[PDB]
Amino acid sequence: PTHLSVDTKFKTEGLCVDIPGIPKDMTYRRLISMMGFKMNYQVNGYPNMFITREEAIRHVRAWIGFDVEGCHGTNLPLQLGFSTGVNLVAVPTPLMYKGLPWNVVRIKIVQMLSDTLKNLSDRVVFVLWAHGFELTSMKYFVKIGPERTCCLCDRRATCFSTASDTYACWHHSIGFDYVYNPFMIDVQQWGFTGNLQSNHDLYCQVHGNAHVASCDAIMTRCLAVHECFVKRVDWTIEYPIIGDELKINAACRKVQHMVVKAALLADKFPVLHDIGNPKAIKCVPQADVEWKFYDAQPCSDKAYKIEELFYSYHSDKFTDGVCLFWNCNVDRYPANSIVCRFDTRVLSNLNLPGCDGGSLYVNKHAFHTPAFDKSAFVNLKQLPFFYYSDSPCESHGIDYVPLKSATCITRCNLGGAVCRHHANEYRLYLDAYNMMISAGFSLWVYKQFDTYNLWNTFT
Ligand SMILES: CN(CCO)c1ncc(Cl)cc1F
Ligand SMILES: [Zn+2]
Numbered sequence: 001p002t003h004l005s006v007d008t009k010f011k012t013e014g015l016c017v018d019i020p021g022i023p024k025d026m027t028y029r030r031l032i033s034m035m036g037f038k039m040n041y042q043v044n045g046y047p048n049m050f051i052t053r054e055e056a057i058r059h060v061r062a063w064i065g066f067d068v069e070g071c072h073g074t075n076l077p078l079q080l081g082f083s084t085g086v087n088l089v090a091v092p093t094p095l096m097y098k099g100l101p102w103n104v105v106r107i108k109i110v111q112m113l114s115d116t117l118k119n120l121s122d123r124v125v126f127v128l129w130a131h132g133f134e135l136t137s138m139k140y141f142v143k144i145g146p147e148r149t150c151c152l153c154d155r156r157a158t159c160f161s162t163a164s165d166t167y168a169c170w171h172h173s174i175g176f177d178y179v180y181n182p183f184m185i186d187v188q189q190w191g192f193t194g195n196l197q198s199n200h201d202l203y204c205q206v207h208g209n210a211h212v213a214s215c216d217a218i219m220t221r222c223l224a225v226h227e228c229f230v231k232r233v234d235w236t237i238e239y240p241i242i243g244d245e246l247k248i249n250a251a252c253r254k255v256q257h258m259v260v261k262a263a264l265l266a267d268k269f270p271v272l273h274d275i276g277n278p279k280a281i282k283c284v285p286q287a288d289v290e291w292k293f294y295d296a297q298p299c300s301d302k303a304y305k306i307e308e309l310f311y312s313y314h315s316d317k318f319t320d321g322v323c324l325f326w327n328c329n330v331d332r333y334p335a336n337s338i339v340c341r342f343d344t345r346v347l348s349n350l351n352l353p354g355c356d357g358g359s360l361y362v363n364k365h366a367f368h369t370p371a372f373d374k375s376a377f378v379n380l381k382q383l384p385f386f387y388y389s390d391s392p393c394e395s396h397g398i399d400y401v402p403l404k405s406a407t408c409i410t411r412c413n414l415g416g417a418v419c420r421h422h423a424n425e426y427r428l429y430l431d432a433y434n435m436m437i438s439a440g441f442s443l444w445v446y447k448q449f450d451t452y453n454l455w456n457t458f459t
């Protein structure tokens with residue numbers, strides 16, 4: 001019990017309007033066969049085209065919604081919709097494309113999945129609300145066989161060329177014409193009542209339905225993400241490194257020690273209220289303050305209501321000292337807050353589109369994050385960039401151009417000439433900070449926060 005058995009049952013009711021007469025008793029084995037594929041009793045690391053929920057969840061970065069609509073079945077033109085927003089029209093002979101045969105349409109499919117997936121995943125998982133035309137259309141652009149490696153690298157193959165009779169991964173697939181060894185999962189096998197739109201719209205206002213293929217494909221992946229990452233949350237599942245995950249996580253630790261350390265030095269709060277992750281530690285262990293912790297798991301669905309977090313009767317006085325919300329998403333921060341809030345709208349490889357304007361940020365773990373709302377920060381201001389150190393000016397061990405910055409808050413710069421050590425640290429910390437910002441995290445602070453207050457911490 002790791003892979004989906006081909007002898008598992010498949011509920012065919014969803015199928016029976018595109019495919020009138022379909023047996024009620026049906027396995028994956030008979031379905032895969034019906035879709036026109038011979039598995040060839042093969043023990044070569046691809047037991048089933050179809051996969052478990054848990055396998056799909058481990059492979060979320062691979063998810064592409066797929067939907068087909070009878071545009072007028074061998075007879076008639078098909079509309080191919082993907083959760084990239086692409087619509088291709090195949091003939092037998094937002095983006096909407098004109099009617100073209102399978103031999104060109106399949107080239108476009110490889111180009112499309114390869115660009116989308118090459119920096120996310122080693123595979124594709126077509127996410128379905130299966131009614132029949134999507135399953136029967138796959139023979140026109142899919143080939144299955146034993147697991148293979150790229151003809152130019154050691155990445156597993158995801159594409160095949162009939163021109164060259166060779167195999168490529170997503171990176172090396174240019175001019176390839178077939179999707180090789182795809183995975184797929186039918187959402188309609190998870191026990192839903194009524195149609196897609198009805199269930200999607202229970203959870204999501206952001207994706208409308210223009211009655212076109214791409215719209216259903218997006219709605220399908222949305223509902224899938226809702227079920228697997230919003231309503232259900234599995235924080236145990238790890239995920240491969242595919243980008244700057246380790247630099248971003250480190251940057252985030254540095255910035256947090258910096259900002260909170262300086263917040264305490266500037267306004268000398270007697271108590272810090274640390275609201276969020278129950279695993280969180282004192283980011284400034286040295287600081288004078290009463291450090292009080294308050295457990296709140298990352299809300300995946302709707303942002304926490306400050307009313308429900310604080311009131312219902314703690315120092316209880318959360319208006320005493322400062323409230324630290326480090327990736328704790330609430331509706332409206334109090335004015336005495338330091339806030340780190342992930343911006344769901346950022347374009348990166350770590351950040352997958354989500355449900356109801358939210359986003360799925362995958363970095364070691366998967367965290368569905370509520371839609372960024374600018375109105376949450378009305379009592380606060382954007383935190384300005386700055387570097388602060390009280391460490392001795394002293395090189396040790398980093399080639400130089402004399403550092404001039406107003407935002408380098410150090411004994412040296414007060415004395416008008418930044419020492420080389422604090423100039424190395426400064427340009428390191430600025431890089432970290434830039435990393436974190438571009439990665440999508442935003443920083444906000446109580447309005448009275450003024451970096452001018454930090455200079456007098458040397459005298
Ligand atoms: C935001 N973030 C990284 C999420 O990818 C993070 N923030 C603070 C600490 Cl202490 C550690 C972290 F990893
Ligand atoms: Zn390759």
Ligand SMILES: [Zn+2]
Binds near residue numbers: 204206207218354355
């Ligand atoms: Zn949606």
Ligand SMILES: [Zn+2]
Binds near residue numbers: 411
């Ligand atoms: Zn110095």
